[PDB]
Design a protein around this ligand. Structure first.
Ligand SMILES: O=[N+]([O-])c1ccc(O[C@H]2O[C@H](CO)[C@H](O)[C@H](O)[C@H]2O)cc1
Ligand SMILES: O=[N+]([O-])c1ccc(O[C@H]2O[C@H](CO)[C@H](O)[C@H](O)[C@H]2O)cc1
Lengths: 665, 665
């Protein structure tokens, strides 16, 4: 039976749940306060058809579907957005080129167009039939037809239920009420703790450099950025920062980084944080190898031992080493690779772990474990982090990590960004290389409208300027990313405080939209792909305005758009507001005031809540943050008229001079 | 611990095995007598490294591998023959375009080049890592390398073990000794009962006709075959023989087959047997619908009920209906479709069956069940059958069925034929349609060198003569199939009596051979594909001769061959013998004597064992069969000299006049 545990959140325990699961792995704390503030709504299945039962060692779940109903979610899918009629086995893996359920974050959470959601809190591989099964006892069992004579015969008859098989003696299930699909998503995310509140520097530009770069090489690239006037907040170091990689020593290479404490200080003195690549596989030359060895799994990954991070005795030496040798030198964060797959790189399910945990549950949660305990080191020091991870799952909403991968299909990169908002994780459509300046710029354009503005040059050695044809436009989009920082910061604050995903699909305020996404509350983004001169944009009801010129674009209609190579199609909702700081090269400090131009689109009176705090510590948890309310409209004369609410006594205030601009002439 | 249960056959029971499994599903009886006649050999794992254990609800198996070792098997794979370094989940399904373990017969049996085999007798889905896992405690654990500096670093380090995970509390495991790989295969097959001994008519030509054909349409096609001088033994009827299909009534359509008893008699009077399409999904208009309904599963397939055939109460009305309405009218056999997949057509694993059997074990064994109980009806009447099935598994060696499917890649069709000999099942690379006469003939050529000589015209309406460009050559290969009948019959007898697969890969007397196969003992077949003028043939050591001219071809060497459109490359081993009957249009009757020309290749003295019995009943089980030994060589003058052993008193004797021909001038 379903206990209403929070407004719009119901929990059922079926059979005997396992003692390890996703929420537990994650150490995921609900945001009770934000949840308590959501509307009481009624239980979304009001007319029966729900079945929860255990049999033959397994838990069988069934939830009914109505005829109108579309489904979204089941994790970070790359080619599909509509999920009804799909069959999946949710299984952490590097993406393999089709949507089978094998993916970086195979979140067992789905959302319906009728405005509810369902989360299956198991760390096993989970099978889903999302409306494919046709039951003989169904109330909607179609009438048998004779294929020999009836041309209306169907190869895929109507199915009226989502079916889920969990390989265990019981499971915890959570149901999220609406009224709208986005509501279900927000409560799910809040149940997970809300999204991480990133530091401002996390929303700036990151350049990752080639594997082999020395300290001098990095110092030079930093100078080139500065000299060329390109923004940069943090640099990614790749495997050659370690004395050995694959497997790793988790200790600085003496040859390429002869003085780490000094190298890290110098970068920081220039405004540059560092983010370090790791996979968590242990070299014999690692300083804690012998200590940790008995707390590792039976099977290795690239000949490195696999720590059982569910054990204090594995956690302590691993993370103490990151703490003492890097974090305490000033390293800002980490890039966690190769905790996903493929099956032939990672441990088999047949592997055994010292804690007794199944290899399967370890596979499903390893990314979560590494996220969790690394994030903790930073929190302990009252310091925010932000970085990258190649696997996550249900339970992982609150972690300071963005998913990336080694796939590269650009269209699919955008589909993944859309599905990220249904999956309780962040994704970045990263930039690495390109066969043309056109492709370079299109990729860079979509990437600055995402969680993380990044070129990953580990193998390519590219820099933002590497394609001379498009170099001026790349710079402009790099500077835009900085200007838009207050817009992104406030979007991310809503992720944290209300569970609102900052990037999500259409219709979350009839056929599938896989190539447009909302970015914050106000912007509809419709990327161009290389080799296209034009594309269609499907605008929702209500009026929309061109992001660049402020001109009316349309209202509930399809547009044909020929944007040119120098623009990514972006439209602003009527009364939409985008606060813009100056084109700074470095994210501003907490003791620093910054001027804002409020860009106001359309004529509908507009309202925007600007988030503000020190941008780097956990002081916000003690209440040291503000929401500055911004209102803009045009008066009688058609002249812009705007207000910003007053700064709050005793709070951080980074808001400088505020001016208002009516974009729609 | 391993009980030697037969010569070269060892059995281990690990933990608590489930009460249902493949051998049990199949009702598979070992051929004790044939097994007792195999060499005692020693247990193939003599130096440890074997691990069998139960943990967390699952059975973990490990078998060691040596450095030299290659692996074969894990079922009916279509693109791969070498299996070492593969990862699979064995799962009955229609083939989906890659070798993942999803396939028609995912036999959990593998064979090593060191000359042993292993069979995992579980009817669950089984995960296999065939030498991918790298264990930290392995005696062959490679030395960690630094990817930053060592260019010899490996992304897939050396693995020294086959690992298998079974989702159950225990399993029965079988190990088969050698000395050679083919030995392990023969014992496995004999453990399963040996292969079926087919009727002679089963090795003739079968034409399946369009779905909609009436009795008159079939009668006409039979006349066209006769009038055009093309051979034909049995005709396949497709779904429009039933009053309804998808789901089925299992009862003759009154409109298309107004008088079934008469229609079946007339065909038989002309030498033509009938083979009827079924899927086993039950229409409401079936005469036993209500009776059977309570013994069907929760979920339907194309709106038809799924009988739980593990229950007498489901079996009785289903098979009584086949018996009374078709078999007793004279129907010779059945074509069993759609017992494989895909997942979105068949029942989900979440489905429930009245017997309590998991939907998973039902999925894994359904084909076996339908094969088993249908075969029984025929055996009960002292009558052999032969037909088609779209799924089988371990346990299914002795059933009178050949696997076929709806895939069509010709190269892959040949790879499947090779892998059939490692999988304990029969496969036919069937002919349906083609975009050219060239493709038609190449397909027809490979198909007459397989278990079943067949055109499946259910949708295409093709006949052997449908491509005028190649029509004369097609006829010749159709007549060859008849001439070669004693060669094929004797090959199939060895399948039954000794477990020797009649079609199998190379090296079963260094890199992968996916496009050549042995057909009986004597013939190496190397098919051409459409658009090729020439191909390489890799000949094993020892001398080989051209099947058409008898000329020396080579010895342990690669040939470049430009055969022409009118020949499929076939080579005969030195001293090889192919007995040829006349080009009859119909398989000969049991009371009928037939002349044979013994075609003898090379100069090495040759010996062939010709099988002989009534070709249609189970009298052979009472000892009414003979092996006629045939010896041929050339004398001093280079003149052919041959003998055939004398017919045995009281036995069937269909051998007429025997003459000998030395093919190698
Ligand atoms: O060629 N490979 O086997 C291979 C392995 C790993 C790859 O990617 C990842 O690690 C890189 C550093 O070695 C880099 O950080 C990348 O972003 C990771 O996904 C690529 C190719
Ligand atoms: O278009 N389809 O959904 C479809 C279904 C089944 C197909 O193949 C099988 O059944 C046929 C008769 O309907 C025929 O016997 C064939 O050999 C079977 O595999 C093909 C297409």
């Amino acid at each position: 039976n379903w206990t209403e545990i929070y407004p719009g959140v119901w929990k059922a325990t079926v059979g005997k749940p396992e003692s390890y699961d996703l929420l537990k792995a994650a150490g995921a704390q609900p945001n009770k306060d934000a949840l308590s503030k959501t509307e009481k709504v009624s239980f979304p299945f009001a007319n029966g058809g729900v079945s929860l039962e255990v049999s033959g060692g397994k838990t069988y779940l069934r939830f009914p579907l109505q005829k109108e109903e579309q489904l979204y979610g089941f994790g970070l899918n790359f080619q599909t957005v509509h999920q009804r009629g799909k069959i999946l086995e949710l299984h952490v893996d590097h993406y393999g080129g089709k949507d089978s359920g094998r993916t970086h974050a195979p979140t067992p959470f789905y959302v319906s167009s009728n405005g509810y959601g369902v989360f299956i809190n198991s760390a096993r591989y989970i099978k889903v039939w999302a409306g494919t099964g046709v039951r003989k006892d169904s109330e909607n069992f179609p009438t048998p037809k004779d294929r020999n004579t009836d041309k209306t015969w169907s190869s895929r008859p109507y199915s009226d239920a989502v079916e889920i098989l969990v390989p265990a003696e019981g499971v915890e299930v959570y149901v999220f009420g609406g009224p709208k699909p986005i509501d279900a998503v927000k409560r799910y995310n809040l149940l997970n703790g809300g999204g991480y509140l990133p530091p401002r520097w996390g929303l700036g530009f990151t350049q990752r450099v080639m594997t082999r770069y020395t300290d001098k090489d990095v110092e030079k690239e930093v100078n080139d950025f500065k000299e060329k006037g390109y923004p940069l907040d943090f640099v990614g170091l790749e495997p050659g920062w370690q004395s050995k990689a694959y497997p790793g020593t988790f200790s600085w290479d003496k040859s390429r980084y002869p003085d780490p404490t000094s190298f890290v200080k110098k970068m920081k003195d220039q405004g540059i944080r560092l983010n370090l690549w790791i996979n968590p596989y242990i070299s014999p030359d690692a300083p804690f190898y012998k200590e940790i060895k008995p707390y590792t799994g039976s099977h290795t990954v690239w000949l490195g031992l696999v720590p059982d991070f569910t054990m204090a005795e594995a956690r302590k030496p691993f993370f103490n080493q990151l703490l003492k040798d890097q974090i305490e030198r000033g390293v800002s964060g980490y890039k966690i690779a190769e905790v996903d797959g493929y099956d032939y790189y990672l441990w088999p399910d047949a592997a055994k772990f010292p804690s007794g945990l199944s290899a399967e549950q370890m596979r499903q949660t390893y990314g979560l474990l590494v996220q969790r305990y690394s994030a903790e080191l930073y929190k302990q020091r009252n310091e925010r982090t932000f970085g990258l991870v190649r696997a996550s799952n249900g339970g992982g909403t609150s972690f300071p990590y963005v998913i990336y991968n080694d796939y590269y299909n650009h269209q699919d990169f955008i589909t993944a960004l859309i599905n990220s908002g249904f999956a309780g994780v962040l994704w970045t459509p990263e930039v690495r290389a390109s066969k043309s300046g056109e492709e370079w710029l299109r990729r860079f354009q979509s990437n600055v409208f995402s969680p993380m503005a990044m070129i990953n040059a580990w193998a390519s050695g590219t820099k933002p300027w590497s394609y001379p044809e498009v170099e001026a436009d790349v710079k402009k989009f790099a500077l835009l990313r900085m200007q838009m920082m207050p817009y992104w910061y406030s979007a991310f604050a809503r992720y944290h405080f209300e569970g609102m995903p900052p990037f999500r699909g259409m219709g979350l305020e009839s056929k599938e939209i896989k190539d447009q996404y909302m970015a914050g509350d106000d912007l509809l983004v419709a990327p161009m792909f290389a080799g296209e001169k034009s594309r269609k944009v499907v605008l929702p009801k209500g009026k929309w305005y061109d992001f660049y010129t402020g001109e009316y674009a349309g209202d509930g209609e399809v547009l044909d758009v020929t944007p040119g190579l120098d623009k990514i199609p972006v439209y602003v909702r009527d009364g939409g507001i985008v606060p813009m700081m100056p084109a700074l090269l470095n994210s501003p400090k907490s003791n620093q005031k910054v001027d804002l131009e409020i860009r106001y689109y359309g004529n509908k009176p507009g309202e925007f809540k600007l988030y503000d705090d020190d941008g780097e510590t956990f002081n916000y948890e003690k209440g040291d943050f503000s929401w500055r309310t911004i209102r803009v409209e045009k008066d009688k004369s058609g002249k812009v008229k705007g207000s910003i609410s007053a700064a709050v006594k005793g709070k951080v205030n980074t808001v400088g001079k505020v001016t208002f601009t009516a974009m729609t002439k």
